[PDB]
Amino acid sequence: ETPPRFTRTPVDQTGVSGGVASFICQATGDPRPKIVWNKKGKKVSNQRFEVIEFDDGSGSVLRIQPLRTPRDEAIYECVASNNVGEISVSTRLTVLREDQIPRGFPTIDMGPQLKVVERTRTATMLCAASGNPDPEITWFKDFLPVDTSNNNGRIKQLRSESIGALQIEQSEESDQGKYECVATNSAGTRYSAPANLYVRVRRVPPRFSIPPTNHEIMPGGSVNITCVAVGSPMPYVKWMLGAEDLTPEDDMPIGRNVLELNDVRQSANYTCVAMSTLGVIEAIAQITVKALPKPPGTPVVTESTATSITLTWDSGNPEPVSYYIIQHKPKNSEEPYKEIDGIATTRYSVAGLSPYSDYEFRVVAVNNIGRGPASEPVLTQTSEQAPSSAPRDVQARMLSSTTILVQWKEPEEPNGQIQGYRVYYTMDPTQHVNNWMKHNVADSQITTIGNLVPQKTYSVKVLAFTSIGDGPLSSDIQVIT
Amino acid sequence: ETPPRFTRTPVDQTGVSGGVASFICQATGDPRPKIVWNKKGKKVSNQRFEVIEFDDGSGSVLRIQPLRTPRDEAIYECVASNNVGEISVSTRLTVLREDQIPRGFPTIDMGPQLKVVERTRTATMLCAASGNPDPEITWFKDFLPVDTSNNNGRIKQLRSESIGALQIEQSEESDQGKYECVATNSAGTRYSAPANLYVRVRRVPPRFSIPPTNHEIMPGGSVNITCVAVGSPMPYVKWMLGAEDLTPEDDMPIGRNVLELNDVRQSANYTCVAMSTLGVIEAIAQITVKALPKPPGTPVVTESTATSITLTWDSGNPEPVSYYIIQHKPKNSEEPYKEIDGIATTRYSVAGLSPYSDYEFRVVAVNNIGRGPASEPVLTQTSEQAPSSAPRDVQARMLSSTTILVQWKEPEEPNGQIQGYRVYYTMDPTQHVNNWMKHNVADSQITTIGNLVPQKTYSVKVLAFTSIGDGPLSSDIQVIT
Ligand SMILES: *[C@@H]1O[C@H](CO)[C@@H](O)[C@H](O)[C@H]1NC(C)=O
Ligand SMILES: *[C@@H]1O[C@H](CO)[C@@H](O)[C@H](O)[C@H]1NC(C)=O
Ligand SMILES: *[C@@H]1O[C@H](CO)[C@@H](O)[C@H](O)[C@H]1NC(C)=O
Ligand SMILES: *[C@@H]1O[C@H](CO)[C@@H](O)[C@H](O)[C@H]1NC(C)=O
C-alpha cells in the first residue's frame, strides 16, 4: 500500500461569465485514491458544478457551467485520499464580465464542427482562436481533458503559428463524443461551443468473436463459459438452453454473455444465441460429465535387464486414456514415488537402474479430466552382472616358508550375489593371468595357500565372481616367503 | 365531453425472431383518452417491450425488440379510456424463425445510411427492399411512425421499382433523430437497421426573440414579464433584479423564462440575462407603480353651433394621459352615455347634433394602466336654426265675402322656438312671394284675414320663423270668398 500522490494538480483559472471553467485533479496510490472537491470547507453541491470522473479513476474534473459571478469566484481544493494518507491542493477561480473583459482575452474565431468519420480513418477537429498574448489551444472530450502528451500516439495536438487542431489517427467507437476546444493565455480562458463527433460502423450481421467451447468435468463440478458476439449493430447475446432462457427475458446483454454453472450434475448440450435486427445466429457447447480415469491394470514385468525393467499393463478404463505416469522407487527407499511423465502407450522400459536391485512400481492413467488413482504395485528385481570393481585392500603375508595368508574386502560394485573369489599367484607376474596358478574359494574374505617354494617373491591378484561371471582383478601385491 | 373513438387501430403482424414489431393505436375524445396495452386482460409490462407516446398524446406505439418466439406470439389489445367511455381493439403477433422464413418474405437490400445535412437543406434517406409479393415500404422516426399521409406536406414517400425513400423538405431540428424503414407484405414485416439523421446548425451567439417590455401597475399589484432568447446552441435565460439572480438561483431554463411578480409595492427595473459560451446578452424591463388617471377637469363649452358643441377640459392628472373618452347624451335621456373613444387632445368638437337640443357631457381619461373615473358632467344647448320644414295641414275657409279663416299645424322641424308665423296671400299666385300681401302673427295655429275682395280665388302660403330666421312656405292652397 502507498499513500496518495498527485500526478496532476489543478491550476488557477480566469473565466468569463456565462461560460465554462474546468479544474483537473489526478492522483496515484494503493489503494485507488478517492477525489473530493471542496470550497473551504465544503463538498461541492450545486446544479452548475459537475464532477466528471476519468475512466481509469485517475481523478476527476470539476466543471462549472454556466459561470455566474461573483458567487463562483472562490478558492477551491482537491483532496485525494485512501486509508494510507491524504493530500490536498488549492486553486483559485476568477470570473469576469464582458463589460470588463480585457481586449486580447482569448476569443474563438472559429470553433470545432460536427464531423462524421468512419472507423479507423483520420478525423480532424479544428479550432481558430486569437488573443494577446497568443492563446494556447487545448482540447476537451466529454468534459474530460484530451491527453496528447505522447507525441507518439494516435491523437496528436498540432499547433502552427496559426492556431491549432486535434488529429485522431485511427478511429474507435470510443472516440465518439462531444469535443470542445479551449483558448488560454495569461489573461484567462475561453471555450468554444461543443461540436459532437460521430463514427459510422457498416451494418453487419452478428458473428461470434468467442464461440462457446465444449467441456467435461467431474460432477459438482462447476464452470464459467464465455459467449462473445460482435458486429454492427452489436447484437444481444442470450444464452439459451435448448428452449429455455437462463437469463430471465427482461435482460439480454450486448456483445457478451458469460454463463455460470453450479453443480454440473449431468451431461448436457447448451446453445448460445446472438441476435441483432439483421439476424439470429446460434452456436452450441457440449457439456458432458465424466470422471477421472480408473486405476490401470496392475503392471506386469515382461522384460528385465541388469539396468532396466519393462512393464506392461491394462488400461483399466472404459474410455480412451491420453497417457500414463509410471511411479518407481527402490524397495525400501521411502521418498515419494519418482514419476516418469508422459508415457503414451501400455508398455514402457524403465532404464538407468542398478544391477541386482529390488524395485517398486505403479502406473497412473491420465485423460482430459485429470489424473486418476495409481494402480496396485508390482515388485521386481533387476538382473545380476559380473562385478564391476576389484576386491579391496588385498593383503598377503608369510605364514611359513611354504605358505601364505591372503585376505581382501568385498568389491564395492558386486552387481550380484558373490558366489566366490579366485586367487591368482605366481613367481612371474609377466605371464598372462590365465597362466598364473589359481585358487578358487567360496564367498569369504580370506584364505591360506601352501606348497610354495621358499625365499621367492610371489605376485598376487584377486577377483570376485557372481552367477554372471568374473569381476576385475586387483592390482598386483607382492609377498615374500 | 365525448367518449374515446379510434382514429387508428393496430393491424395483425408477422415478424421475424430477433427483430422489431410495432403496434399503433390512436384515438380521440374529451377529455384526452389514456392508452393501455393489454395481453389477455393484463397490462403488458416491459420485458424488452416499449410503449412510445405521440407528442400530441393521440395515442402510442407498442414496440417489441428483439422479437422472441414463441413467447411473444400472442393476442394483444389497445384500450382507450376517459371518464366518458372506453374502447378496445385486439391484434395478433406472429414471429418466425429464419430457419423457417418463407420464400418471398421481405428483405432489406439496402437500408438507410447516416447523413449530415445542415439546417434548411433537404436530406433524403433511402431504402431498397425485395420480396414476393412486392413489399410496401414505410418509415419510422424515433420509434414513432412517419406520417406522409398528406400528399401536400413537407415529408413525402417516393417509390420506383424495388425502392422507396423518405424526402424531408426544409430541414428542422425536430427532424433530427433515428430513422428506420420497414418492408411489409402478406408474408410479414422486416426492419432495416437504424440510421440517424442530423441537422447541423452553424454556431451562433444568443439573441432576444422576445425582449422584456416595460410596465406600470397599482401596488399589489401583479404582472408576468416574459423573456425569450434564441440562437445556436440555444441559451439559458435567467431573471435578475440587476445585481442578484432570482431564485431558484442555480436553476436555469432554456430560451424562455417568464417572471411572475406577486404583490408589487414599488417602482423598479429588472434584468433578463441570456447566456451562452459564445457570449452573454442582457435586457431590462421597467416596473413602476400607479393607478388609473384622476377624473379629468370638468368639461367647459367654448364653442357652439346648431349641430355641434366644442369642449375643452383640464387633464386633471399629474402624469401624462394617453387619450380621452367623451360621454354624451340628450339631457333627459335616462339611458347610459354614448361614448366617443380615442380623443388625443384636451379639446374636441362633438358634431352631428340636432338644433336647439340639450346635451350632457363628461370626459374620461385613459393611460397605459387603464380607464379612469368620469368627470363631473356639463350641461349645454345647441344653437337654433330657421325651421327646415313648412307648417303642416294648412287649411283655409270662407267666413264672409271679405274674410277667411286660416289655420295650420306646427312644423315638424322648428329647430328653435317658433316666435310666430307669416301668412302670404294674393289673387295672383304667379307673383314672387315677397310681393304677395302679408300678415304677421305671434305663436299660434289660427288667424283671420279680412278686407278681401268678394268672388275671388286667393292663394295662401304660410311659413314659420324662429329667432334665427324664416322657415319654408307651405305649398299653395286656394280658398274662394
Ligand atoms: C466463475 O465465476 C465466478 C463469479 O464470481 C468467478 O469469481 C470465478 O473466478 C469463475 N471461475 C472460473 C473457473 O471461471
Ligand atoms: C449433444 O449433441 C450430440 C451431437 O454431437 C448428440 O449426439 C447428443 O445426443 C447431444 N446430447 C444431448 C444430451 O442432447
Ligand atoms: C401569469 O402566469 C400564470 C402562470 O400559470 C398564469 O396562470 C396567469 O394567467 C398569468 N397571468 C397573466 C395576467 O398573464
Ligand atoms: C429604472 O431605470 C431607469 C433607467 O432606465 C431609471 O431612470 C429609473 O430611475 C429606475 N427606477 C428605479 C425604481 O430604480
Tab-separated table of C-alpha atoms in Angstrom, chain A residues 109-473:
chain	number	residue	atom	x	y	z
A	109	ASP	CA	-12.613	32.912	-34.190
A	110	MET	CA	-13.913	29.544	-35.328
A	111	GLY	CA	-14.838	26.538	-33.242
A	112	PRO	CA	-14.998	22.785	-33.837
A	113	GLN	CA	-17.508	21.464	-36.324
A	114	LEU	CA	-19.838	18.486	-36.293
A	115	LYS	CA	-17.980	15.758	-38.124
A	116	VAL	CA	-18.592	12.223	-39.300
A	117	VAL	CA	-15.626	9.974	-39.845
A	118	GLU	CA	-15.919	6.257	-40.354
A	119	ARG	CA	-13.995	3.842	-38.180
A	120	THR	CA	-10.199	3.654	-38.388
A	121	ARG	CA	-9.930	6.747	-40.601
A	122	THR	CA	-8.335	10.011	-39.541
A	123	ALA	CA	-10.662	12.692	-38.228
A	124	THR	CA	-9.617	16.271	-37.522
A	125	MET	CA	-11.350	18.711	-35.180
A	126	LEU	CA	-10.363	22.323	-35.677
A	127	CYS	CA	-10.001	25.470	-33.566
A	128	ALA	CA	-9.286	29.050	-34.575
A	129	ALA	CA	-8.683	31.452	-31.689
A	130	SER	CA	-6.866	34.755	-31.237
A	131	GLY	CA	-5.720	36.908	-28.337
A	132	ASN	CA	-2.808	38.865	-26.896
A	133	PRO	CA	-0.583	37.200	-25.853
A	134	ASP	CA	-1.222	34.400	-28.356
A	135	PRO	CA	-3.622	31.857	-26.832
A	136	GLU	CA	-2.637	28.249	-26.162
A	137	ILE	CA	-5.084	25.715	-27.573
A	138	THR	CA	-6.146	22.598	-25.677
A	139	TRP	CA	-8.987	20.100	-26.119
A	140	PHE	CA	-11.731	18.509	-24.033
A	141	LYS	CA	-13.681	15.338	-24.808
A	142	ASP	CA	-16.903	14.563	-22.929
A	143	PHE	CA	-15.866	17.190	-20.345
A	144	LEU	CA	-12.580	15.355	-19.712
A	145	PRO	CA	-9.273	16.789	-20.997
A	146	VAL	CA	-7.790	15.136	-24.082
A	147	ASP	CA	-4.362	13.647	-23.446
A	148	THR	CA	-1.989	14.207	-26.350
A	149	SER	CA	1.057	14.246	-24.075
A	150	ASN	CA	2.695	11.441	-26.022
A	151	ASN	CA	3.924	12.764	-29.370
A	152	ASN	CA	3.904	9.048	-30.195
A	153	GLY	CA	0.145	8.486	-30.078
A	154	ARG	CA	-2.965	8.200	-32.243
A	155	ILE	CA	-4.040	11.592	-31.041
A	156	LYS	CA	-1.636	14.468	-31.503
A	157	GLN	CA	-2.163	18.167	-30.972
A	158	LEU	CA	-0.825	20.203	-33.814
A	159	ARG	CA	-0.460	23.919	-33.407
A	160	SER	CA	1.036	26.037	-36.112
A	161	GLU	CA	1.732	29.752	-35.883
A	162	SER	CA	-1.884	29.901	-36.987
A	163	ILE	CA	-3.789	28.429	-34.015
A	164	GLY	CA	-4.288	24.721	-33.852
A	165	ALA	CA	-6.248	21.494	-34.234
A	166	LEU	CA	-6.679	17.935	-32.948
A	167	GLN	CA	-5.860	14.886	-35.069
A	168	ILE	CA	-7.274	11.401	-34.418
A	169	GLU	CA	-5.204	8.850	-36.363
A	170	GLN	CA	-7.312	5.681	-36.051
A	171	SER	CA	-10.990	5.948	-35.147
A	172	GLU	CA	-12.624	3.817	-32.474
A	173	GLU	CA	-16.209	3.778	-31.198
A	174	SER	CA	-14.584	5.162	-28.050
A	175	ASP	CA	-13.566	8.337	-29.925
A	176	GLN	CA	-17.233	9.243	-30.491
A	177	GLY	CA	-18.487	12.071	-28.269
A	178	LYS	CA	-18.635	15.797	-27.561
A	179	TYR	CA	-15.461	17.787	-28.267
A	180	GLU	CA	-14.761	21.401	-27.336
A	181	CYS	CA	-11.569	23.409	-27.723
A	182	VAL	CA	-10.208	25.866	-25.182
A	183	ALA	CA	-8.141	29.014	-25.697
A	184	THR	CA	-5.987	30.139	-22.783
A	185	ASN	CA	-3.441	32.841	-22.003
A	186	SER	CA	-2.192	35.000	-19.130
A	187	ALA	CA	-5.455	36.959	-19.219
A	188	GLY	CA	-7.782	33.980	-18.948
A	189	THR	CA	-9.658	31.108	-20.561
A	190	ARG	CA	-12.420	30.829	-23.179
A	191	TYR	CA	-14.347	27.845	-24.512
A	192	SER	CA	-15.722	27.265	-27.968
A	193	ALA	CA	-19.139	25.691	-28.352
A	194	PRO	CA	-19.394	21.893	-28.257
A	195	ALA	CA	-19.105	20.002	-31.527
A	196	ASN	CA	-20.139	16.367	-31.486
A	197	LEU	CA	-18.226	13.642	-33.310
A	198	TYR	CA	-19.904	10.505	-34.634
A	199	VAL	CA	-18.457	7.281	-36.054
A	200	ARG	CA	-20.226	5.085	-38.580
A	201	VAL	CA	-19.826	1.322	-38.494
A	202	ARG	CA	-21.003	-0.556	-41.584
A	203	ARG	CA	-24.047	-2.607	-40.743
A	204	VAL	CA	-23.051	-6.235	-40.253
A	205	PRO	CA	-24.954	-9.359	-39.273
A	206	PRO	CA	-23.866	-10.694	-35.897
A	207	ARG	CA	-20.910	-13.053	-35.531
A	208	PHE	CA	-19.191	-14.996	-32.775
A	209	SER	CA	-15.918	-13.425	-31.660
A	210	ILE	CA	-15.526	-16.094	-28.987
A	211	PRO	CA	-17.842	-19.094	-29.604
A	212	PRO	CA	-18.640	-21.374	-26.628
A	213	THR	CA	-16.219	-24.283	-26.276
A	214	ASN	CA	-17.221	-27.718	-25.006
A	215	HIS	CA	-16.327	-29.238	-21.632
A	216	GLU	CA	-16.112	-32.315	-19.463
A	217	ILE	CA	-15.699	-32.318	-15.650
A	218	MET	CA	-16.467	-34.390	-12.547
A	219	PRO	CA	-19.900	-33.664	-11.045
A	220	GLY	CA	-20.072	-30.664	-8.707
A	221	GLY	CA	-18.366	-29.670	-10.834
A	222	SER	CA	-18.530	-26.061	-11.971
A	223	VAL	CA	-17.592	-23.949	-14.993
A	224	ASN	CA	-17.993	-20.481	-16.456
A	225	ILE	CA	-18.393	-20.495	-20.242
A	226	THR	CA	-17.942	-17.348	-22.316
A	227	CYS	CA	-20.002	-16.367	-25.336
A	228	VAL	CA	-18.930	-13.248	-27.191
A	229	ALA	CA	-20.621	-11.894	-30.298
A	230	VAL	CA	-19.698	-8.805	-32.315
A	231	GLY	CA	-20.943	-6.981	-35.395
A	232	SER	CA	-22.990	-3.900	-36.284
A	233	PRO	CA	-25.379	-3.165	-34.829
A	234	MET	CA	-23.919	-5.016	-31.847
A	235	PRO	CA	-26.240	-7.895	-31.115
A	236	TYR	CA	-27.893	-9.189	-27.995
A	237	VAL	CA	-26.132	-12.224	-26.622
A	238	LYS	CA	-28.597	-14.532	-24.982
A	239	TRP	CA	-27.689	-17.880	-23.504
A	240	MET	CA	-30.315	-20.445	-24.325
A	241	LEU	CA	-30.684	-23.951	-23.045
A	242	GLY	CA	-32.379	-25.790	-25.941
A	243	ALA	CA	-35.650	-23.920	-25.416
A	244	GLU	CA	-35.490	-22.186	-22.049
A	245	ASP	CA	-33.532	-18.987	-21.490
A	246	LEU	CA	-31.482	-18.944	-18.297
A	247	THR	CA	-31.110	-15.226	-18.275
A	248	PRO	CA	-34.604	-14.039	-17.461
A	249	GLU	CA	-36.090	-12.233	-20.501
A	250	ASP	CA	-36.036	-8.721	-19.122
A	251	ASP	CA	-32.272	-8.743	-19.547
A	252	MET	CA	-30.350	-9.623	-22.682
A	253	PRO	CA	-26.882	-8.097	-22.669
A	254	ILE	CA	-24.844	-6.734	-25.581
A	255	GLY	CA	-21.903	-8.483	-27.231
A	256	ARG	CA	-21.040	-10.566	-24.184
A	257	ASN	CA	-22.997	-13.230	-22.336
A	258	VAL	CA	-20.939	-15.389	-19.984
A	259	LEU	CA	-22.732	-18.266	-18.278
A	260	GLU	CA	-22.056	-19.529	-14.739
A	261	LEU	CA	-22.878	-23.168	-13.939
A	262	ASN	CA	-23.049	-24.600	-10.413
A	263	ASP	CA	-23.210	-28.352	-9.730
A	264	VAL	CA	-22.922	-29.699	-13.257
A	265	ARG	CA	-24.890	-32.774	-12.212
A	266	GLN	CA	-25.367	-34.135	-15.739
A	267	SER	CA	-24.039	-34.187	-19.286
A	268	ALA	CA	-25.846	-31.679	-21.494
A	269	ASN	CA	-25.816	-29.571	-24.621
A	270	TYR	CA	-26.106	-25.784	-24.417
A	271	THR	CA	-26.833	-23.128	-27.031
A	272	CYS	CA	-25.515	-19.596	-27.243
A	273	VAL	CA	-27.777	-17.377	-29.307
A	274	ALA	CA	-26.764	-13.921	-30.510
A	275	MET	CA	-29.181	-11.687	-32.392
A	276	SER	CA	-29.454	-8.213	-33.894
A	277	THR	CA	-32.028	-6.643	-36.217
A	278	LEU	CA	-30.148	-8.179	-39.159
A	279	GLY	CA	-30.293	-11.789	-37.925
A	280	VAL	CA	-30.170	-14.550	-35.347
A	281	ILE	CA	-27.015	-16.622	-35.061
A	282	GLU	CA	-26.560	-19.739	-32.967
A	283	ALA	CA	-23.753	-21.893	-31.544
A	284	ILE	CA	-23.663	-24.896	-29.234
A	285	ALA	CA	-21.407	-26.031	-26.408
A	286	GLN	CA	-21.232	-29.669	-25.328
A	287	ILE	CA	-21.200	-30.145	-21.578
A	288	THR	CA	-20.632	-33.735	-20.570
A	289	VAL	CA	-19.662	-35.138	-17.214
A	290	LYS	CA	-17.047	-37.835	-16.971
A	291	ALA	CA	-14.806	-38.759	-14.087
A	292	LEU	CA	-11.074	-39.029	-13.608
A	293	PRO	CA	-9.741	-42.292	-15.039
A	294	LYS	CA	-9.855	-45.614	-13.173
A	295	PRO	CA	-6.537	-47.019	-11.896
A	296	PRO	CA	-4.679	-49.017	-14.609
A	297	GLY	CA	-4.375	-52.796	-14.637
A	298	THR	CA	-1.635	-53.991	-12.279
A	299	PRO	CA	1.743	-53.691	-14.040
A	300	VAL	CA	3.425	-56.897	-15.188
A	301	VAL	CA	7.148	-57.371	-15.781
A	302	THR	CA	7.703	-58.774	-19.274
A	303	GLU	CA	11.355	-57.817	-19.770
A	304	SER	CA	14.255	-57.288	-17.394
A	305	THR	CA	17.927	-56.423	-17.690
A	306	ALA	CA	20.610	-55.557	-15.151
A	307	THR	CA	19.752	-51.887	-15.668
A	308	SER	CA	16.185	-51.949	-16.983
A	309	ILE	CA	12.698	-53.352	-16.434
A	310	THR	CA	9.885	-53.327	-18.999
A	311	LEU	CA	6.301	-53.085	-17.748
A	312	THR	CA	3.042	-53.955	-19.474
A	313	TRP	CA	-0.396	-53.139	-18.083
A	314	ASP	CA	-4.121	-52.999	-18.761
A	315	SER	CA	-5.622	-49.543	-19.320
A	316	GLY	CA	-8.237	-50.303	-16.666
A	317	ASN	CA	-10.590	-47.743	-18.199
A	318	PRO	CA	-13.727	-47.949	-20.424
A	319	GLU	CA	-12.822	-44.775	-22.323
A	320	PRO	CA	-9.511	-43.924	-24.037
A	321	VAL	CA	-6.640	-42.682	-21.866
A	322	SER	CA	-4.397	-39.811	-23.003
A	323	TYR	CA	-1.182	-41.124	-21.427
A	324	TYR	CA	0.314	-42.763	-18.344
A	325	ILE	CA	2.589	-41.899	-15.445
A	326	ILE	CA	4.892	-44.583	-14.064
A	327	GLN	CA	5.810	-44.435	-10.393
A	328	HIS	CA	9.083	-46.035	-9.303
A	329	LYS	CA	11.433	-46.375	-6.335
A	330	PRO	CA	13.805	-48.887	-4.641
A	331	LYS	CA	12.017	-51.484	-2.476
A	332	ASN	CA	12.862	-49.667	0.760
A	333	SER	CA	13.508	-46.102	-0.436
A	334	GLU	CA	10.838	-44.044	1.293
A	335	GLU	CA	10.782	-40.707	-0.513
A	336	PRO	CA	7.554	-40.320	-2.526
A	337	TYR	CA	7.476	-42.341	-5.760
A	338	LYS	CA	9.639	-40.939	-8.508
A	339	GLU	CA	7.483	-40.338	-11.549
A	340	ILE	CA	8.024	-40.708	-15.273
A	341	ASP	CA	5.543	-38.417	-17.005
A	342	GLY	CA	4.067	-38.556	-20.496
A	343	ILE	CA	4.073	-42.259	-21.353
A	344	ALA	CA	1.846	-42.685	-24.396
A	345	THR	CA	1.488	-46.484	-24.515
A	346	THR	CA	0.687	-49.513	-22.349
A	347	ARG	CA	4.290	-50.727	-22.330
A	348	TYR	CA	7.454	-48.955	-21.192
A	349	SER	CA	11.050	-49.869	-20.343
A	350	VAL	CA	12.395	-48.091	-17.270
A	351	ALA	CA	16.138	-47.688	-17.769
A	352	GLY	CA	19.082	-46.352	-15.782
A	353	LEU	CA	18.525	-48.852	-12.972
A	354	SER	CA	21.168	-50.644	-10.900
A	355	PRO	CA	22.120	-54.359	-11.203
A	356	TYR	CA	20.618	-56.838	-8.717
A	357	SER	CA	18.239	-54.334	-7.132
A	358	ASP	CA	14.676	-54.572	-5.857
A	359	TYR	CA	12.209	-52.092	-7.363
A	360	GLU	CA	8.667	-50.923	-6.672
A	361	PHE	CA	6.170	-49.728	-9.301
A	362	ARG	CA	2.730	-48.290	-10.067
A	363	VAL	CA	1.019	-46.904	-13.159
A	364	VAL	CA	-1.289	-43.882	-13.272
A	365	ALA	CA	-3.794	-43.031	-16.003
A	366	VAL	CA	-4.431	-39.508	-17.282
A	367	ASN	CA	-7.243	-38.295	-19.531
A	368	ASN	CA	-8.582	-34.825	-20.358
A	369	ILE	CA	-10.305	-34.621	-16.964
A	370	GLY	CA	-7.133	-35.198	-14.983
A	371	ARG	CA	-5.085	-37.754	-13.082
A	372	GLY	CA	-6.653	-40.947	-11.739
A	373	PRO	CA	-5.617	-43.133	-8.782
A	374	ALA	CA	-2.408	-45.168	-9.007
A	375	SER	CA	-2.594	-48.874	-9.827
A	376	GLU	CA	-1.733	-51.615	-7.338
A	377	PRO	CA	2.039	-52.090	-7.051
A	378	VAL	CA	4.342	-54.714	-8.538
A	379	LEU	CA	7.680	-55.737	-7.030
A	380	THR	CA	10.618	-56.971	-9.093
A	381	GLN	CA	14.394	-57.241	-9.305
A	382	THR	CA	16.976	-56.205	-11.896
A	383	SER	CA	19.293	-58.876	-13.298
A	384	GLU	CA	22.776	-59.622	-11.997
A	385	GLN	CA	26.053	-58.617	-13.617
A	386	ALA	CA	29.650	-59.614	-13.201
A	387	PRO	CA	31.191	-57.353	-10.535
A	388	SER	CA	32.483	-54.046	-11.887
A	389	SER	CA	35.104	-53.416	-9.214
A	390	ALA	CA	38.037	-55.372	-7.784
A	391	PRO	CA	38.220	-56.708	-4.221
A	392	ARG	CA	39.548	-54.016	-1.893
A	393	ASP	CA	42.520	-53.858	0.486
A	394	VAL	CA	44.149	-57.043	-0.810
A	395	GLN	CA	46.876	-58.169	1.580
A	396	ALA	CA	49.245	-61.114	1.836
A	397	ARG	CA	51.808	-62.090	4.468
A	398	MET	CA	54.124	-65.041	5.109
A	399	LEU	CA	52.984	-67.831	7.416
A	400	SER	CA	55.836	-70.238	6.730
A	401	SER	CA	58.497	-70.607	4.045
A	402	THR	CA	55.874	-72.559	2.085
A	403	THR	CA	52.504	-70.995	2.990
A	404	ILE	CA	50.961	-67.516	2.876
A	405	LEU	CA	47.768	-65.837	4.067
A	406	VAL	CA	45.718	-63.797	1.600
A	407	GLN	CA	42.795	-61.558	2.532
A	408	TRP	CA	40.606	-58.913	0.922
A	409	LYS	CA	37.386	-56.950	1.305
A	410	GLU	CA	34.249	-57.247	-0.830
A	411	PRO	CA	34.197	-55.245	-4.082
A	412	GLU	CA	32.108	-52.075	-3.831
A	413	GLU	CA	30.288	-52.993	-7.034
A	414	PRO	CA	29.357	-56.704	-6.858
A	415	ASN	CA	26.319	-56.280	-9.156
A	416	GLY	CA	25.021	-59.594	-7.846
A	417	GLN	CA	25.434	-62.266	-5.211
A	418	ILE	CA	29.129	-63.004	-4.697
A	419	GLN	CA	29.470	-66.723	-5.391
A	420	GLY	CA	33.188	-66.723	-4.654
A	421	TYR	CA	36.661	-65.406	-5.419
A	422	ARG	CA	39.638	-66.589	-7.455
A	423	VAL	CA	43.175	-66.095	-6.173
A	424	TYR	CA	45.929	-65.801	-8.766
A	425	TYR	CA	49.564	-66.171	-7.740
A	426	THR	CA	52.917	-66.657	-9.447
A	427	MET	CA	56.669	-66.084	-9.276
A	428	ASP	CA	56.489	-64.486	-12.736
A	429	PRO	CA	53.951	-61.605	-12.883
A	430	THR	CA	54.708	-61.013	-16.584
A	431	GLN	CA	52.695	-64.089	-17.560
A	432	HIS	CA	49.097	-63.731	-18.688
A	433	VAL	CA	46.793	-64.102	-15.680
A	434	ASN	CA	45.289	-67.290	-17.140
A	435	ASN	CA	48.752	-68.877	-16.837
A	436	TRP	CA	49.215	-67.993	-13.171
A	437	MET	CA	48.436	-70.587	-10.523
A	438	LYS	CA	44.838	-70.300	-9.363
A	439	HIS	CA	42.989	-70.924	-6.114
A	440	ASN	CA	39.176	-70.922	-6.053
A	441	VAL	CA	37.372	-70.055	-2.824
A	442	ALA	CA	33.688	-69.671	-1.903
A	443	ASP	CA	32.257	-66.414	-0.553
A	444	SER	CA	34.832	-65.349	2.024
A	445	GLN	CA	37.396	-62.638	2.654
A	446	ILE	CA	40.470	-64.717	3.488
A	447	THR	CA	42.392	-67.883	2.548
A	448	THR	CA	45.696	-69.723	3.002
A	449	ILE	CA	47.903	-71.036	0.186
A	450	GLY	CA	50.628	-73.637	0.682
A	451	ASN	CA	53.161	-75.695	-1.284
A	452	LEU	CA	55.010	-72.515	-2.238
A	453	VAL	CA	58.763	-72.510	-2.811
A	454	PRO	CA	60.675	-70.600	-0.074
A	455	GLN	CA	62.524	-67.299	-0.415
A	456	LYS	CA	60.638	-66.205	-3.545
A	457	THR	CA	58.595	-63.147	-4.492
A	458	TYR	CA	55.013	-64.109	-5.286
A	459	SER	CA	52.713	-61.688	-7.107
A	460	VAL	CA	49.037	-61.965	-6.180
A	461	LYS	CA	45.791	-60.863	-7.849
A	462	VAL	CA	42.184	-61.436	-6.736
A	463	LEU	CA	38.793	-61.138	-8.466
A	464	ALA	CA	35.180	-61.693	-7.398
A	465	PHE	CA	32.542	-63.529	-9.409
A	466	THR	CA	28.751	-63.705	-9.372
A	467	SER	CA	26.465	-66.127	-11.184
A	468	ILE	CA	27.084	-63.960	-14.263
A	469	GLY	CA	30.892	-64.008	-14.424
A	470	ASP	CA	34.302	-62.824	-13.226
A	471	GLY	CA	34.883	-59.294	-11.963
A	472	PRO	CA	38.097	-57.267	-12.382
A	473	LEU	CA	41.397	-58.340	-10.797
